[PDB]
Amino acid sequence: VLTEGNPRWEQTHLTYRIENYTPDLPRADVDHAIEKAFQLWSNVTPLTFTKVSEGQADIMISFVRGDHRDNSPFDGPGGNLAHAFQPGPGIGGDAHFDEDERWTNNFREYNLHRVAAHELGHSLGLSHSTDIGALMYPSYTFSGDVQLAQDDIDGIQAIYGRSQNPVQP
Ligand SMILES: [Ca+2]
Ligand SMILES: [Zn+2]
Ligand SMILES: [Zn+2]
């Protein structure tokens, strides 16, 4: 047990990179969905996320289909719609999205941002909850706009703290 409890990120700032954009949606709209999710978490936490166009990033995001050299192949549109590894070296922190399902940004079948935000919850060590107003709810539900819940804000803030930032005149 090198780290006490679950391995938490020692740095207060993290970086991320998109390995590739699926032809499911234009990259311009995918960056907005992913960029908006990180901003929401950083908005209520002193944590910061910066996109990198080169070099290895703390969080790697990519899209894969069927079996992709992993011990958890997707079983058709059934099973989980995506998954991620625990925050750690090697494949740890990586997050894959099932490109077999059709991703959308409206009342369609599913919202890509809702699933992306859920993956971040697991990456930050956040667990599911019985609060229907929480995005990490086990059952998928259309809530329209995606916003964090007080239960989730207090949870991530308790681990790190409040986003205090005394600005000078
Ligand atoms: Ca699936
Ligand atoms: Zn995968
Ligand atoms: Zn989950």
Swiss-Prot record:
Zn(2+) 1 binds at residues 68, 70, 83, 96. Residues 1-169 are annotated as: Metalloprotease. Ca(2+) 2 binds at residues 58, 90, 92, 94. Zn(2+) 2 binds at residues 118, 122, 128. Ca(2+) 1 binds at residues 24, 99. Glycans are attached at residue 20. The record marks 43 as: Not glycosylated. The active site is at residue 119. This is 22 kDa interstitial collagenase. The chain holds residues 101 to 269 of 469 of the full protein.
